[PDB]
Structure formats: C-alpha cells, structure tokens
Amino acid sequence: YQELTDLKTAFERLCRHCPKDWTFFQGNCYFMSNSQRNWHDSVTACQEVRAQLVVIKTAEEQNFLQLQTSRSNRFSWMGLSDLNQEGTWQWVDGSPLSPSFQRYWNSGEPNNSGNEDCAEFSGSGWNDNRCDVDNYWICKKPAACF
Amino acid sequence: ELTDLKTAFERLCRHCPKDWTFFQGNCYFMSNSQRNWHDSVTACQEVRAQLVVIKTAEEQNFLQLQTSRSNRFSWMGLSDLNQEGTWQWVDGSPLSPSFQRYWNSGEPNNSGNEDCAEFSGSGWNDNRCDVDNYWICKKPAACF
Amino acid sequence: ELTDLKTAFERLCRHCPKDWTFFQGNCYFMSNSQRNWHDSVTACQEVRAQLVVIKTAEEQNFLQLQTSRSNRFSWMGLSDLNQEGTWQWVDGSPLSPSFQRYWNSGEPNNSGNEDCAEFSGSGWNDNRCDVDNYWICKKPAACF
Amino acid sequence: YQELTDLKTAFERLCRHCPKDWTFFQGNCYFMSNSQRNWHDSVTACQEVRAQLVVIKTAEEQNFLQLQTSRSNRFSWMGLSDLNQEGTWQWVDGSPLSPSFQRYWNSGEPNNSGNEDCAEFSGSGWNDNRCDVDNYWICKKPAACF
Numbered sequence A, D: 001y002q003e004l005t006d007l008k009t010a011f012e013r014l015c016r017h018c019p020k021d022w023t024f025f026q027g028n029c030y031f032m033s034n035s036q037r038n039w040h041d042s043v044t045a046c047q048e049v050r051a052q053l054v055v056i057k058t059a060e061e062q063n064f065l066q067l068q069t070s071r072s073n074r075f076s077w078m079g080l081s082d083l084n085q086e087g088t089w090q091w092v093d094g095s096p097l098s099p100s101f102q103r104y105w106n107s108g109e110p111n112n113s114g115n116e117d118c119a120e121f122s123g124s125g126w127n128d129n130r131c132d133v134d135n136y137w138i139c140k141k142p143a144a145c146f
Numbered sequence B, C: 001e002l003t004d005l006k007t008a009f010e011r012l013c014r015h016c017p018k019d020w021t022f023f024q025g026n027c028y029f030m031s032n033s034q035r036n037w038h039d040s041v042t043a044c045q046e047v048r049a050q051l052v053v054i055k056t057a058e059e060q061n062f063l064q065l066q067t068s069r070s071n072r073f074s075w076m077g078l079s080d081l082n083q084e085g086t087w088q089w090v091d092g093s094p095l096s097p098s099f100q101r102y103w104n105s106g107e108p109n110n111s112g113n114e115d116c117a118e119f120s121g122s123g124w125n126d127n128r129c130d131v132d133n134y135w136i137c138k139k140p141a142a143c144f
C-alpha cells in the first residue's frame, strides 16, 4: 500500500487536460467566471460547459479555491445551499456538508434568518448570502487525458 | 488502490494509431488490402506490430465481433508450416489445448497444404498460405 | 514486483519538453528571461505548468544544484501576499513547519513589502513581488 | 500480487523500441544476421551493435528463437559454449546451462570429443559444432523506450 498510493497518484496526474482558461488541480479543472450571476444561474451556467458549481470534497481543495478567489478579490458562489431554509446545508451533488467543514464559515456564519441560503467565498472564509445576489462563480469538472 | 491504479493506467494508455481499434490494452489493425500469409507477416512487422497472436478468450470474441461487420477472412499469426499438425503462433508459442475449441467445424486439416490460419466471424479455418486475404495486426496501445 | 513496476514506470514516463530538465517524475523549466512574480505565475500557466511548488527535500536539493551552475535568483510558487507572515504555495497549501529550514539566513521578513519568495543557490529569500527575476516552472513528466 | 504481474508486464511492454531490421520479443530486440561467421567473430560482431550473442533465459524465448531460425532454414550460433572442452556448457554472460535446458539438444547432443564446443540451432533442436564453422548468428539486446 506504501507505493500504491504514490504510483496511483503519479499516474492519475498524467491526465491533466483542461479547457482554455481553466486551471488544473488534483485531477480536476476549475473555471473562474468573468461575469457575475445569481446562484441558480451559476448552477446552470456551469452545466452548459459540462461542469458543476464547485463541490468541495477535501481541505486541500478548499485551500486551493480560497486562494484563487482571494487572488482576484472576488466573492464567488460554490455549489452549497440550504434551500429548505432550515440549517441543513447540502452540496449540489446531493452530499451533505460534513461536520469537519463547518470550520470554514466566517464568524457568525451561517444564519437561520434573512433568507440567505447560498454559500459564497467571502474574504478568508465562507459566508451565506441571498441567492439572488450577483457573484462570480467557480465551475469544476474532471480533468481529461486528451 | 491496486485496481484504481489500473483504471488510471487503462484510462491513460489507450492511444492507437489512426485507423486501428483499441481493445483491452492493445491496438488492432484490420487491413485495407489482401496478401498471402508471409507478406501479411512482414506487413505487420513494417508497422512495429505482429500478425495477431490471440492470448485471451475476450480478444478472440472481440475479433469475431469486429470481423462480423464485414464477414471478412483474415490471416492471423498462427501456422503449421512444418506440417506436423503442430500449430504455433508467430511469437513461437504453441496453440494451447484450451484454444483448440476456436477452430471452425471441420478445421484444421492434416492434408491439402493448408498450413496457415485465417480468422472468420465464427472461428478459425486453416488454408493455403499463398491465398490472398486481409490481415490483422496487433501491438500495445500507447499512453500519448 | 511492486518496485519493479515503478522502475518500468520511472523508465517509460520521463519525457520532458525541449529545454526542460527531468527529475524524479517531473519536468522543470529554468526561464530564459525575467519577469515579476505575478507575470511569472501566468507564464507557467501558459505552458500548462505551475510556478514551482516544492514538495520534497530532494527536489529542493536538485533545484539548488541546478541554480548553482548560474547563481540565478528565481521566483518560486510561494508567497505571503496578504502580509500575515503566512506563506502559501500557489496550489493553496501552507508552508509546512519542516520546510521553514530552507529560508536563507535572515529570511523571511515581516516588513518591506517583500511578499514573494525567490529561489537561490543556498535557499529562499523573500523579496518585492515587482522585482524582475528568472522563474522556475514545474509539471509532470510524460510517457511519450 | 495478482494484478502486479499483469500491470508490471503491461507496462514493460510499452518500451519496445528496436533498431531497423531487429525483431521485438518480451522486452528484448533480436537481430538475425545476413552473413555467416565463426562463433568467436559472431560474439564480437554482436558487441559492435551494442548487443550479445543470444543468451536464452526462458523456454518461451527458446521457442521464439527456434521458430525464427527455422523460418529461414538457417543454422544459427547462440551464446553457449564449452571451451574448457569438458562437458561444462556456459552462456557468454557467465551463467551455466541449467539442467532444465538439456532437453533442447538434438538426440545424441552434446558430444565429449570431436572439438565441437559451440552451440547452434540445428533443425528443431540444438547441436554442438566446431567453433570455426561459418553460421548465421542471432544478437540480443534490451529494448529501449525511445
């Protein structure tokens, strides 16, 4: 198992093809929008380019993403929301926000009232915001070998 | 992770030359012209490949499916040139006992100077090595 | 056979673009011109690579040997742009505690707007991000 | 170990580069001469092209080689000899002829007398012959990745 991890990784890293203007990171391609849209229109905007409003699965991915948005100083949408409006945050892929990720919300975040059910990268952490607000968005999709 | 590694490998290394078909790690070339068995052998060597040597039942099945869309007869890397009823692949290996099942009904033959194998949609036939047939070349798929 | 597999892998996948140097699975590009830190970052992205992020002690050593033949100063994918004394690689990862040893004596600094790291023959120095330096790009070696 | 063997093999098979006119087989390149020379001159002739008078290491290699020489109906030298003239056959790489390979000699082969201390592929098996005789020869060298 010692080598398997290394080799497996070294191998998966060879398939790193991403579209033009997209950035590669650990097996996936990321797209930083050039315009702004509300949450819902961002969810569909990503599907149009065969991607998905970014669903964060590891702490390393979260670090990469936060660095990207802060580099351009833009507030960006992520595929996380609580549309049932009851403290249950879920990723657009259907998975639930794991306990170990609550650490990423900025102090005071999230909030039960105010009709703010969409997560965004805001400053050095996460903020919940009105889904109708206009923000940049980040798309994510598997990297290809060709 | 062992299996996941193969998936990565299987995913990355599946590059085949233009007009060759990929299948389980290899590239297969169905010719666009016919030649006798010996010239088919050199034809494959010229493209750094080998007149197809069948190693698995799946490959045999795949080649049958490919062949079925045209109903061709193709030379394969199998022969009994010394006429001993001793069939060998061009890589020197003997036709194992478990692969003898692939001969079509009535094949092979210990008579008629039919010392070469041809691949059809239902199995193998033995035939005169000088006959003109299409051929099938085989070589490993690449990674880039 | 595990190790023997790597040897095969290590042997086959060591292809690097023209003018890049291969080292333990990766390709390194020592620039032929200078730019500021941000333009160096985009310069690497333009060639499907990344301003070098150092992951092992061996790589650090290798880059020092490479650098020593010219005594250059090169931008590396490390910065503290928010000026927190919090250094991060361009892939988002924090400078681990065990890699802090590579800073040259007297580096880094919590003053002087020197928020970018430059690679020298003896270690790292922090410097104004607008200064013009050569740069080092990194990306995986290929198999063909 | 089950997969390791498959994968390892599938991988080694990707480095199959051989010179012009040389034939590839299981990780190595083989050259069938176009002229004839005695044994000793064949040993050096192969070194000139960065190879070695073929040293057979497996039964599968032996089958491949025997098929090659019989295809052209040529008697060919191999890197096997008993120059000490005392029933001790050794490969040019210094390794000894293993017990399980004695099966390849043609009936009656080898012989203690007659000054025949060099092995050749003769017919469907091996023959020992006078080293000064002219035969075709087969060179062998590792296959490259480039």
Ligand code: NA
Residues within 6 Å of the ligand: A082, A110, A111, A112, A113, A115, A116, A117, A118, A128
């Ligand atoms: Na909320």
Ligand code: NA
Residues within 6 Å of the ligand: A109, A111, A116, A127, A128, A129
């Ligand atoms: Na909020």
Ligand code: NA
Residues within 6 Å of the ligand: B080, B108, B109, B110, B111, B113, B114, B115, B116, B126
């Ligand atoms: Na026959």
Ligand code: NA
Residues within 6 Å of the ligand: B107, B108, B109, B114, B125, B126, B127
């Ligand atoms: Na027949």
Ligand code: NA
Residues within 6 Å of the ligand: C080, C108, C109, C110, C111, C113, C114, C115, C116, C126
């Ligand atoms: Na500083």
Ligand code: NA
Residues within 6 Å of the ligand: C107, C108, C109, C114, C125, C126, C127
């Ligand atoms: Na400094």
Ligand code: NA
Residues within 6 Å of the ligand: D082, D110, D111, D112, D113, D115, D116, D117, D118, D128
């Ligand atoms: Na003898």
Ligand code: NA
Residues within 6 Å of the ligand: D109, D111, D116, D127, D128, D129
């Ligand atoms: Na003899």
